[PDB]
Design an enzyme around this catalytic site. Structure first.
Site, PDB file in Angstrom:
ATOM      1  N   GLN A  85       0.852  -1.213   0.000  1.00 44.00           N
ATOM      2  CA  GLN A  85       0.000   0.000   0.000  1.00 44.00           C
ATOM      3  C   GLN A  85       0.878   1.251   0.000  1.00 44.00           C
ATOM      4  O   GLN A  85       0.435   2.361  -0.337  1.00 44.00           O
ATOM      5  CB  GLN A  85      -1.011   0.007   1.148  1.00 44.00           C
ATOM      6  CG  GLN A  85      -0.358   0.090   2.517  1.00 44.00           C
ATOM      7  CD  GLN A  85      -1.404  -0.048   3.609  1.00 44.00           C
ATOM      8  OE1 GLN A  85      -1.917  -1.118   3.895  1.00 44.00           O
ATOM      9  NE2 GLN A  85      -1.722   1.106   4.188  1.00 44.00           N
ATOM     10  N   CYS A 134      -5.244   0.704   3.370  1.00 43.21           N
ATOM     11  CA  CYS A 134      -5.415  -0.684   3.820  1.00 43.21           C
ATOM     12  C   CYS A 134      -6.856  -1.146   3.583  1.00 43.21           C
ATOM     13  O   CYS A 134      -7.130  -2.299   3.178  1.00 43.21           O
ATOM     14  CB  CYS A 134      -5.000  -0.837   5.287  1.00 43.21           C
ATOM     15  SG  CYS A 134      -6.027   0.143   6.427  1.00 43.21           S
ATOM     16  N   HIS A 150      -6.129  -1.447  11.537  1.00 41.09           N
ATOM     17  CA  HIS A 150      -5.528  -1.893  10.245  1.00 41.09           C
ATOM     18  C   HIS A 150      -6.512  -2.879   9.650  1.00 41.09           C
ATOM     19  O   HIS A 150      -7.027  -3.711  10.414  1.00 41.09           O
ATOM     20  CB  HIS A 150      -4.095  -2.399  10.513  1.00 41.09           C
ATOM     21  CG  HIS A 150      -3.414  -2.847   9.254  1.00 41.09           C
ATOM     22  ND1 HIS A 150      -3.458  -2.159   8.071  1.00 41.09           N
ATOM     23  CD2 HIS A 150      -2.699  -3.966   9.021  1.00 41.09           C
ATOM     24  CE1 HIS A 150      -2.784  -2.825   7.146  1.00 41.09           C
ATOM     25  NE2 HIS A 150      -2.309  -3.913   7.710  1.00 41.09           N
ATOM     26  N   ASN A 172      -1.492  -9.552   4.232  1.00 42.92           N
ATOM     27  CA  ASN A 172      -1.265  -8.113   4.531  1.00 42.92           C
ATOM     28  C   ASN A 172      -0.947  -7.388   3.218  1.00 42.92           C
ATOM     29  O   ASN A 172      -0.779  -8.019   2.138  1.00 42.92           O
ATOM     30  CB  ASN A 172      -0.279  -8.033   5.695  1.00 42.92           C
ATOM     31  CG  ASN A 172      -0.278  -6.664   6.356  1.00 42.92           C
ATOM     32  OD1 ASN A 172      -1.131  -5.829   6.035  1.00 42.92           O
ATOM     33  ND2 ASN A 172       0.657  -6.413   7.264  1.00 42.92           N
TER      34      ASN A 172
END
Length: 212
Positions: free
Chosen positions: A19, A25, A159, A175
């Protein structure tokens, strides 16, 4: 549901992204679920645009954070373009959807997983990748380099990521911090601790797209 689930193994997960220096996110997380559900339903794995969510979801705050469920609503109402059509730039610009032709895909809905319920989340994961939130601010999470992560961490969620499988004692998460973090960009978070928030508050707010 099986003892082990790994959407990567069934070809429902695209390569890990970064990102960068943009709090997008929420958009990354949503796109993971979108890519998964389209493969599952249609047989094709595509990449979809995090950038378009960033630019177009005006309920969210661009590179300043946002809501996976807001982003998922947008794709349900309007639709989404392929990633190569609307590539990631890591900065919020104007919404260019119209300029880019017809949408590549559209979902039918968004559902919430019942919160603070491990079983409910595993069930969901067994069906498709799910959008999940966790507390990533702690140095321990940030420095994670592999293994089953147990914390330390609190439940101050901050997150958004995506759950793409589980095993007897972990949940597998994708992630958006590049391939250099964790286990090639993934983390295995301990499950079955009996903590109803989940480790790092993982059971707080989980969403998935509906596609008929």
């Amino acid at each position: 549901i099986p003892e082990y689930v790994d959407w990567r193994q069934k070809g429902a997960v695209t390569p890990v992204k970064n990102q960068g220096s943009c709090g997008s996110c929420w958009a990354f997380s949503a796109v993971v679920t979108i890519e998964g559900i389209i493969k599952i339903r249609t047989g094709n794995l595509n990449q979809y645009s995090e950038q378009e969510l960033l630019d177009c979801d005006r309920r969210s705050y661009g590179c300043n954070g946002g809501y996976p469920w807001s982003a998922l609503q947008l794709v349900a109402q309007y639709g989404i373009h392929y990633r190569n059509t609307y590539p990631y730039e890591g900065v919020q610009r104007y919404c260019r959807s119209r300029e880019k032709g017809p949408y590549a895909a559209k979902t039918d809905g968004v559902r919430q997983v019942q919160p603070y319920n491990q079983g409910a989340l595993l069930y969901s994961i067994a069906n498709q990748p799910v959008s999940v939130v966790l507390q990533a601010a702690g140095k321990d999470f940030q420095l994670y380099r592999g293994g089953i992560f147990v914390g330390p961490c609190g439940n101050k969620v901050d997150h958004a990521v995506a759950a793409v499988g589980y095993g007897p004692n972990y949940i597998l998460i994708k992630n958006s911090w590049g391939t250099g973090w964790g286990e090639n960009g993934y983390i295995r978070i301990k499950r079955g601790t009996g903590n109803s928030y989940g480790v790092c508050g993982l059971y707080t707010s989980s969403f998935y797209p509906v596609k008929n």
